[model samples]
Structures are given as C-alpha cells and as structure tokens.
Target chain A: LECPQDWLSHRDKCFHVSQVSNTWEEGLVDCDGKGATLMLIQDQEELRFLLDSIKEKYNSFWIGLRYTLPDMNWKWINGSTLNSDVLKITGDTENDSCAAISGDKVTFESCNSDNRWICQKELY
Target chain B: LECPQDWLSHRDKCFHVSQVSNTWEEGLVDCDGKGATLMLIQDQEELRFLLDSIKEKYNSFWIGLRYTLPDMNWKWINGSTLNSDVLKITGDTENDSCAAISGDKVTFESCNSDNRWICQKELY
Candidate 1:
C-alpha cells in the first residue's frame, strides 16, 4: 500500500507529523479528517523511529492516549489499557489528562493543552 | 526502521527504482553504490506493490535474477536458484539471460539490454 501525499510510509503504516498545534481533542478531529488517528505507538523500535523523525523539529506531540476516570486508568483510542511494559507516562494521573510525547519521554498533560500532534494510518 | 532519501520503506526493507536505464550488469554497480542490491522480490504481494508504484511511469525494470551457465539455472544475487514456486519468468531459458519486470509479468531479457533497475536494502 502507498502513503498519502506528504505522509511518511514505513513498515506497512503511514505517518504524518503536524506543523501546527492543537488541543488533544482537536488533534483527534484533525487526524480523523485525514482518515487517520492520533499516533498509537506499538513498540520501543517504533517509538525510537518516531523520535528520530521529529528530532530537532518537534519537542512535544499528542498521542492517542488519555486517562479514563470510569476505568481509573490510562487507555488508548482502541480501548486498550496502557501496557506498562511498552510505555509508562510520567506524573500523577488526573481526570481529563492526556498523553504527549517529547524526546523519549511520555507525560500526562491537560487535555486543553495545545501541542503538535502525530497521525497514523495502516497501509492495507 | 528508517529508509534512505527517495527510497520507499515497506515491511522490513527499503526500495529504490532507478530513473536511468542501464544494462543488467551496470545496474548492480549502481545499486551497490547506494549500499543496496538489485531488487530481489520475495512474494507476489511485493511484486504487486512494486507494479503499483511504477504504474504509468515505467514499463520495464531490471531485477536481481540472471541465468547462470555454470548451474544452468536462473539465480538471484544471493546465489539462490530462482524458486519457480514464487515467480516464473515468461520466456525460453537462454544463456546470459536476465530478468525484468513489466506490469504483472516477469520475463527474461538480454543481459546487455538497457532497462531501468530497482534496488533494495534492508532497514536494520
């Protein structure tokens, strides 16, 4: 499968890093508009590749992760619980908190925080 | 894993399709210069994806398959004999014959024929 114009293709997936900043919720809307979702990191290798891609350009970007009060835990857009073995978010979990990545670190931030975002879609 | 500039990353490998035409032997030199080898297709899926990539832009491109007189068989650059189970060239076996792809078909061509070539490298 091929990636869309201006999108980077790697490992059966297409990725887009935004130039503009937006709220975490707004970032999801933007990604959905492009037929994608906010980035859902899979492994350490994928995370390292993404970190390399954004080095010296983006310091922080919203990912598809947030604290869910109902479950009292962090979860991904696909309703999967955060796998501590894969990644761990720093800071205390609070309601309405979202996840953002900077360098090799992941942290919790206010959902209203404005930040650049990454989008991803699979190549089929 | 990341791909080099102008190379397409898919699965675990990176691919580059040449813009200039060259003989089969010359094609290997060009690929080697880029730290790659002439394309060695793995499966039909890869072949189809490459066909899609070059559609309407290129009609023919050299691959890493050539007839070896010593073994009396076609071999890939890695010295592995061509697996008829994967893909079969559509021409009579001839000495000094090399493989080229056009659309969905693979065929034997003269080693001296000028054709665009595809190069591939692994993203380690």
Candidate 2:
C-alpha cells in the first residue's frame, strides 16, 4: 500500500517524515524554523500512538528527551521539567549517552551516533 | 573536557539531542509542541555547519528534506519549494523511501527504519 498522505496526522496535527545526517545541534535548528520542537511523551496515550505507528522494528529515531545534568537528569526538550509521577523513564545509562525509546519506553544511546528524525507541524 | 554548554549553538540557536524509536508521525507531533519543525537545509553555509559539527563518520541521520512526489520531487518540510541552486539533493532511491543526509547532501531511507534524532530550539 502507498504511504498515507496523512499517515503521521493525529488530532489536528501533521508531521513530516524527513531524515538528516546531523549532530544533535543541526537537527534542532531545522526543527525550530518549522515551528516545532523535539519529541516529548507526556503520557501513555502519546507513547502508545508513537509506538504503534512504527512500521518496522529494531530501529531507533530521535525524540525530544535528553539527559543534560552532570548527574544525568533527564528532561524533555520542550522546556518542561519532567514529572516522574506522570511518566517514568527507562533504558538510561551513562555511556549509551543520549535517550531513545523502544516499546514505548526510554532508552539511551551515544550522541555521536546517526539516526532518523521526525518533525511536527500543527494545523490548529 | 565536558560537553560544551552550547556545543550545538549556532547563531543563537540551541538544539537538543534526543533519540526515539518512532515513526515519522509521532516525531512530528513531539516537535510541533516544541515550536519547531523538521530540518531543512537552505544553503551551503547551513550545510557546512551541519557537516562540520558531526563528530563521527559512516553513520546516517535524519534531516528535514523529503521526496514526496511519484517522480521524487524533493522538498523541505517547511512548506518552501526546494531550490536546487542553493542546495542540491543526493542519495535518493525508491525502497530507501524517506530522506536522510550525509556529508552535506540528501539521501533516501526506509520510513520504518529506526535512527537517532536532533531537535532545535532558538534563542530570541
């Protein structure tokens, strides 16, 4: 079947499928111009939608989560302080350095690594 | 050597490094709430900055460029028509369906494939 014209759409939002061979920084600026930020999972519903949408397995993509503190305090890139009561993070490590998700849970990876990207644009 | 406070900073922009095993749609929504969009390289300068910033080689990452037309008319996700004069695309294929970039040019990849991500935020 052909890719859905609005396959990435949900609740009045449309996301574009684009990939870049960029460091963490370049990816951010590209997203900024489009009026969106990184991926942030606020609840299980969002998480489920994300996980279920995948057409393949065993591949990782970028999201809006990061661990920036010296002690590795993880936070969503949206500028909202994380509330573990609402969402619990998994797959954290010091060397797998950055954050990723699989099966609707968080995991960590290296920053220098390369991966795909998903950028969002809202209709309303 | 600690990671630079703003290693990814360029022209007052701050990007976050996040990874998700997400499809294109989920990524877009996550970015939309952050006030950004997927990556779009408009010029050689932006391309150079992205290429130079990469700390490793031989790995692919996602950018904001995509080929949506049946004949593969590549476009940036920002809704701007692509101008090949300023930026030329490379690495396109039918099965490697989506877009990715390496060495300051565009390439194609599978949508269901998992990869890392970079999201951008701007100051001022």
Candidate 3:
C-alpha cells in the first residue's frame, strides 16, 4: 500500500500532521494543498489513535469543526454537522469557533488563532 | 523585600505570566503598569527558569528583544547586547526577532503577531 511520503497509515487512511502553524482557514487551505482535508474523527477510537499519532508540535492543533451561527451548531469541514456527542470535544460556551485536540481532549478555541494541524485523506 | 500579590518570586525578582494577550510594545506597557519591563533573560539559568516559569498560555511570548535597523543586532530591553550565546535560543536568521520561550528553547518570531506574555519586576 503506497501513500504520500512522510504520511502515516492508520487502518485505511493516510494522515499527516503539518507542523506549520496558521489560522483555522489557512489550516484548511494547507490540507487542500496537500490533497487532504482537515481530519474528520469518525468515532472515539480514531480520536484516540490520532491523539497519539500527532507527528509534531503538540501545542494544540485545529481539527475540522466549527460552530456555525444559524443554530449555534458545530459543523465539520466535510459539510457534516456535528452533534458534539460523537467526538471527544469540549467547549467553554464562549467565542470559540474551531476545535483543537491535545492529550485526549478537544478544546473549543477561536478560529483566528494560528496553530499546527492534522490533515487526512483516503488511501487507495 | 516583599512583592505584589499573585506574583512568583525568584531571587529578588517577581514574575507574572499575564495570560492577557498583546503586541510586544503593548507587553512592555503592561509590564510597566504591573511594575516590570518584560522578564529579561539575564543569563542562561534565568532563561531556563523562565521556560519552566511560563505561567500559562505556553504558545509563545515577547522577551524584550528585537533587531534594530542599521544595526541588525538583537538587544535586550534592559540595554544589554545579546551576542547570541547565553540563552537556549534559536532562529531562522531571517525576518525574525522578538524572542519567545517554550519548553527548553527560545525561538525568534515576528514582533507584530499577538501572544501571551511574561512580566517581571524587582522586590523592594
């Protein structure tokens, strides 16, 4: 099974942690630039695996979710709305727009702050 | 010599990690108001202590230094020349200055970006 250079293989997907720090929107662009998208946590186990798989810079990186204002809902970058019960997420009920995970927990943070991030894509 | 409340003591000095974010110059103003001038890393030992003493917001911080035009030399705010050999510092040698500490290393970063900071003053 071949994958992009320096990419990590897990189960059936390829994941990469871009140590370069940038704002949340710039982070999304980084994923697209590398032919991936911000990582989508399929379930709890994947979240656990990803926490341990951080390639570099453990200083809180953006995941692919945001709080949409229409209904004050958290939505994933893949166009799926998050219910907040599926992933290991937490929030402070404030001006947080993006989700960042570190040490087994998801922290709600502002989308404007720059951070390193995880990118994901399917392996063929 | 007694120090202000909520401040940490290290040899005749008081340090506080103002978790409040701001620009480097703004950081200097904050330190002045709180009775400090941005924790100056006087020696390698103090720099190490500071790395461990970062109160919160360990992302990055302003450390009283930047490159001066026509000189291109790094100077500490306390009117001292950095010569580049004392602290555990690193840089890309490019458009970087405004020293910041994390873990056990100091990295040169842009002066314009906002971040958490440290402030310090002498006990009297």
Scored by TM-score, the top model is: 3
- Score residue B49 of candidate 1 by CA lDDT: 86
- lDDT by residue (B1-124, candidate 3, tens digit) is 5777888788767888866776666777888887577765544556566666654435676666543223234332223443334111212233333545544444434454456778878775
At residue B23, what lDDT does model 2 achieve? 47
True contacts kept of each: 0.00, 0.00, 0.00
Q: Could you give candidate 1's per-residue lDDT for residues B13-76 as a string of tens digits? A: 8999988887788888898999988876655567678778767433558877664333234332
Model 3 accuracy (lDDT, Cα): 0.58
TM-score of candidate 2's A chain against the true A chain: 0.57
The sequence of per-residue lDDT tens digits that candidate 2 reaches over residues A1-124 is 3323654766555555445554444555666776775554434455456657865334555555433323334333333443453122212233223334444444334444455655565555
User: For residues B1-124, what per-residue lDDT tens digits would candidate 2 score against the true structure?
Assistant: 3323643766545554445644444455655666764544434455457657866334445544332223444333333443443122121233123334445444444444355545565554
Give the CA lDDT, 0 to 100, for residue B60 in model 3.
72
Q: Where's the lowest-lDDT run of ten residues in candidate 2 chain A? A: A86-95
Q: Return whichever of 2 and 3 wins on TM-score.
A: 3
Select the stronger candidate by DockQ from 1 and 3: 3
lDDT tens digits, residues A6-31, model 1?
A: 99877878899888987788888899
